[PDB]
Chains A and B, each alone.
With several copies, the nearest count.
Chain A
Amino acid sequence: AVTINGITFYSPVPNQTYKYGQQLVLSIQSQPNALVTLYVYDPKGNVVYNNVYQTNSSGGLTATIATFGSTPGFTTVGTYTVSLSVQGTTSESASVNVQYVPLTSTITATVVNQEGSPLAGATVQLYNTTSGSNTLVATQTTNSQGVATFTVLSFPGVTQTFKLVASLQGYAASTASVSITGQQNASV
């Protein structure tokens, strides 16, 4: 790995991509008896996470730092700069730019006729019926590729129920429902 300034950066390294409930790790080859005052500079120029971690008497360290997605100020998009201000015995100031985007899921409705032609012309409404209530976040006009794809926020470990109502002129309006638990393609 890249040996930024003599201390061997193993992590963070510049350009790292993160998701909902994924972990920042700190492992760097320091000189012993080093702390790292670790600053997650958010895209509004603020350290939403300052915390002081301790390296071991050898040169190494494998530490878990910050759990992104599972804490407020990390629950929605955008780019952070974790500055390691390695405030040890050796001052290393590395701007290590990092990204984040939440998890997102596609849930799919389909219509067909046994004529051998898929049906079309549907106003198809997917509802966020995880709330306990039909919170409309995306409505689609059904496409000719026979996937009604709609992008909505998602989170790990929740039975994200969605009601798919098909209202279409020329055939019967119908209501099915699915549940994605974590990330999965829900197609009926």
Chain B
Amino acid sequence: NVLPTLTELAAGNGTFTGSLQFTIVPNNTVVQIPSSLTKTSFAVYTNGSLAIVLNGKAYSLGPAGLFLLPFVTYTGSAIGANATAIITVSDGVGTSTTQVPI
């Protein structure tokens, strides 16, 4: 058992409380869009990757974003925080550019 136990202190007690512990170790995975059909190219690295942490030891429970609000379902896979959208306004001044370290 590695779930937080639900405890009965003695007969008469009734509180039964669980818990879980989480860290995100990254996973970055390119959702790609061009800059000549929308103005703006996009590398969108999807949403880190969960991991449960018991006494400092992490084990990668896969793309977090979907579980954890805020999220937006781009390509049906919800991308959340721990991401980046890099924004390329390409035009005849060369290329203007801005960035959201999400």
Interface stretch of the complex, out of B15-23, B32-40, B53-61, B91-99:
B32-40
Return the contact of B37 from the options A2, A29, A31 (Cβ within 8 A).
A2
Q: Are A3 and B76 in contact (CB under 8 A)?
A: no
Q: Are B33 and A59 in contact (CB under 8 A)?
A: no
Q: Are B75 and A8 in contact (CB under 8 A)?
A: yes
6 A-B pairs with least C-beta separation: A59-B76, A2-B37, A8-B75, A3-B33, A2-B33, A29-B76
Give residues 1-49 of A contacting B (CB, 8 Å).
Answer: 1-4, 6, 8, 13-14, 29, 31
Q: Which residues of B contact A58 (CB under 8 A)?
A: 76
Given contacts A3-B31, A3-B33, A3-B74, 19 further A-B contacts (CB under 8 A): A1-B33, A1-B75, A2-B34, A2-B37, A3-B42, A3-B75, A4-B38, A6-B72, A8-B74, A8-B75, A8-B76, A13-B37, A29-B74, A29-B75, A29-B76, A31-B73, A58-B76, A59-B73, A60-B76
* B66, chain A: closest CB distance, angstroms: 12
Chain B contact residue count (CB 8 A cutoff): 11
Q: Which residues of A contact B37 (CB under 8 A)?
A: 2, 4, 13-14
Q: B residues bordering A, Cβ < 8 Å?
A: 31, 33-34, 37-38, 42, 72-76
Q: Which residues of B contact A4 (CB under 8 A)?
A: 37-38
8 contacts between A and B (CB under 8 A): A1-B33, A1-B75, A2-B38, A3-B42, A3-B74, A8-B75, A29-B75, A59-B76
Closest to B41 in A: A2
Q: Which residues of B contact A6 (CB under 8 A)?
A: 72, 74
Q: Are A29 and B33 in contact (CB under 8 A)?
A: no
Q: Which residues of B contact A1 (CB under 8 A)?
A: 33, 75
Q: Which residues of B contact A3 (CB under 8 A)?
A: 31, 33, 42, 74-75
* A6, chain B: closest CB distance, angstroms: 7
Q: Which residues of B contact A29 (CB under 8 A)?
A: 73-76
